[PDB]
Amino acid sequence: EAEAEPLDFVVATEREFEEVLAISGGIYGGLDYLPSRYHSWLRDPDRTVVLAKRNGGVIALESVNVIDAGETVLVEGLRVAPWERGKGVAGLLQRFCSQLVKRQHPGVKVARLTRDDQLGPRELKKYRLITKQGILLVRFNASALLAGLGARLAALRTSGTFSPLPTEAVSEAGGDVARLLLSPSVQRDVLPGGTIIQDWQPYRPSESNLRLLAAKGLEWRVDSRARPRVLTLCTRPFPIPHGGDGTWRYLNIDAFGSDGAQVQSQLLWHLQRQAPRLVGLNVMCQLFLEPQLWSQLADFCQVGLGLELVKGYTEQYLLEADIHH
Numbered sequence: 001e002a003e004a005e006p007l008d009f010v011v012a013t014e015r016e017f018e019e020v021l022a023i024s025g026g027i028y029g030g031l032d033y034l035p036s037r038y039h040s041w042l043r044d045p046d047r048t049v050v051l052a053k054r055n056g057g058v059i060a061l062e063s064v065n066v067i068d069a070g071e072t073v074l075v076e077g078l079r080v081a082p083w084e085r086g087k088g089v090a091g092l093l094q095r096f097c098s099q100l101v102k103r104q105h106p107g108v109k110v111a112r113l114t115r116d117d118q119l120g121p122r123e124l125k126k127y128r129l130i131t132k133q134g135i136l137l138v139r140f141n142a143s144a145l146l147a148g149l150g151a152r153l154a155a156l157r158t159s160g161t162f163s164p165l166p167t168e169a170v171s172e173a174g175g176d177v178a179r180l181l182l183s184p185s186v187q188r189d190v191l192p193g194g195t196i197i198q199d200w201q202p203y204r205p206s207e208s209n210l211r212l213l214a215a216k217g218l219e220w221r222v223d224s225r226a227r228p229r230v231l232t233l234c235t236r237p238f239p240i241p242h243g244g245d246g247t248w249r250y251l252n253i254d255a256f257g258s259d260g261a262q263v264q265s266q267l268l269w270h271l272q273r274q275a276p277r278l279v280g281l282n283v284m285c286q287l288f289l290e291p292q293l294w295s296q297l298a299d300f301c302q303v304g305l306g307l308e309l310v311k312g313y314t315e316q317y318l319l320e321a322d323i324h325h
């Protein structure tokens, strides 16, 4: 039997927040950002959050955000209510949103997205792979980490097993971020596929996008400002639904470059910076890094820092498709 009422595509408002939550159960195994981010999305000037409704009720959501100085649309948050899946809803929503973008933003040349599910024949046919990072997901209690870290490092030092390497400060206000990310050799030799990936969101390394990043409260670290080889980027932690008790936060660290020892030392630096703010809370900490460094960093986290690995190796794919007419 056909559905009694047709699909309607509308721009999201704060009124649908509770309805959007109701369709989002179980997404990303509890690491879903949208509960914490929905209200900020509605304020973003280049973003349109589209809801698919049937008979007045929300059944799907997609966000399109124009970035890269008008040349790219980033697709985020695609979701269909569990009870509406497998019927083509996501496909219809994607088509409405692509038509909307082409209508309102003729300058947009490509669509981009990130994902971590295995790529099948279909994906490789429709999308170009710009780059990929390995994904390392660990969990810890922030207070327990802080209470034990001193003794942990001290034993690692006296054992001759690990000592933190020197790292260098990166100030956005001071202009360090721009000097690094606008350097063509950093873009070629450090950034994955020449791209900034920040909490799953890809940006071409441009002054326009640096203004967007500057507003997010990010923390950066580098091995050497004069001779950059490893650059790391920590996104401010935010609440996630995991566990259902409100105590969990998601801490995203993107690591760019090939020197595993510096990824280790910079990871430690970010943990020492961020964990004091997370006292009393539980942390899903997800590190994105060059794939050939994953095993080194997984051992460092589990053996070195006593952190608990949440899942095995997976990959973050940055995918791109041309816009067509």
Ligand SMILES: N[C@@H](Cc1c[nH]c[nH+]1)C(=O)O
Binding pocket: 028, 075, 076, 077, 078, 113, 114, 115, 116, 199, 200
């Ligand atoms: N395309 C996904 C990327 C992602 C974030 N977290 C997990 N996956 C989204 O925007 O929701």
Ligand SMILES: [Cl-]
Binding pocket: 116, 117, 118, 313, 314, 315, 316
């Ligand atoms: Cl994967």
